[PDB]
């Protein structure tokens, strides 16, 4: 996308989202990132939504195929491997954008925590399909990114901040689903929920809606886990 203007890439990413063309959206946002300028709050959301939808489809397909494979020629394994490789390529692409050079230029809490949560998420997706000599290293890479994001968010953001809440939600899912630490997952979700509840009185009607929506997701997980 080197020949397209940054503003045109952003405008087309928004159009692609409206058209539910998430692969296009992701390619446009990849082009925007590669222009080398920092991303605004809105632009970070476009980048994240695009790739989350792309990899979300790949994860769903991989789970269908992995399930068929476990029930069971080489075809099912071969095709699961093809989907798995494509998923890993997307995760590697996102991680490459974060590393070159989104994270190192992100100084504000809102951008730095957001990018590090992203980094934890895409290593988590890599961990979901990992089975070799590096599942452990991938899990530790996810944990380290989430942990750095938590530390910053606890120091710099109020307990109701939606980025702080969604980071804690996903880190708790990491604990439960990847790290085999359900007690840590439950403790984190419950402490996050309780500290947000105690801060809701400070919020406007619209911020209250933003925060309580994510608190409900924490509660939903706790209901499933307990």
């Amino acid at each position: 996308m080197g020949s397209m203007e940054r503003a045109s890439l952003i405008q087309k990413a928004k159009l692609a989202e409206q058209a539910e063309r998430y692969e296009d959206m992701a390619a446009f946002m990849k082009g925007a990132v590669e222009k080398g300028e920092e991303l605004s709050c809105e632009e970070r959301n476009l980048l994240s939504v695009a790739y989350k939808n792309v990899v979300g489809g790949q994860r769903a397909a991989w789970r269908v195929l992995s399930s068929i494979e476990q029930k069971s020629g080489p075809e099912v394994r071969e095709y699961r491997e093809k989907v798995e490789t494509e998923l890993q390529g997307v995760c590697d692409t996102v991680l490459g954008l974060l590393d070159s050079h989104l994270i190192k230029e992100a100084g504000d809490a809102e951008s730095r925590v957001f990018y590090l949560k992203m980094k934890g998420d895409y290593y988590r997706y890599l961990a979901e399909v990992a089975t070799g000599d590096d599942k452990k290293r991938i899990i530790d890479s996810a944990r380290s990114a989430y942990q750095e994001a938590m530390d910053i968010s606890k120091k710099e953001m109020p307990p109701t901040n939606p980025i702080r809440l969604g980071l804690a939600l996903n880190f708790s899912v990491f604990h439960y689903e990847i790290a085999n630490s359900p007690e840590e997952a439950i403790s984190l979700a419950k402490t996050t929920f309780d500290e947000a509840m105690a801060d809701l009185h400070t919020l406007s009607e619209d911020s209250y809606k933003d925060s309580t929506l994510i608190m409900q997701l924490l509660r939903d997980n706790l209901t499933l886990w307990t």
């Binding site: 994240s48 939504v49 998420d121 899912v173 997701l217 997980n221």
Partner: peptide
């Protein structure tokens, strides 16, 4: 277990 949605 649900993770965070984008929108």
């Amino acid at each position: 277990a649900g993770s965070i949605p984008g929108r």
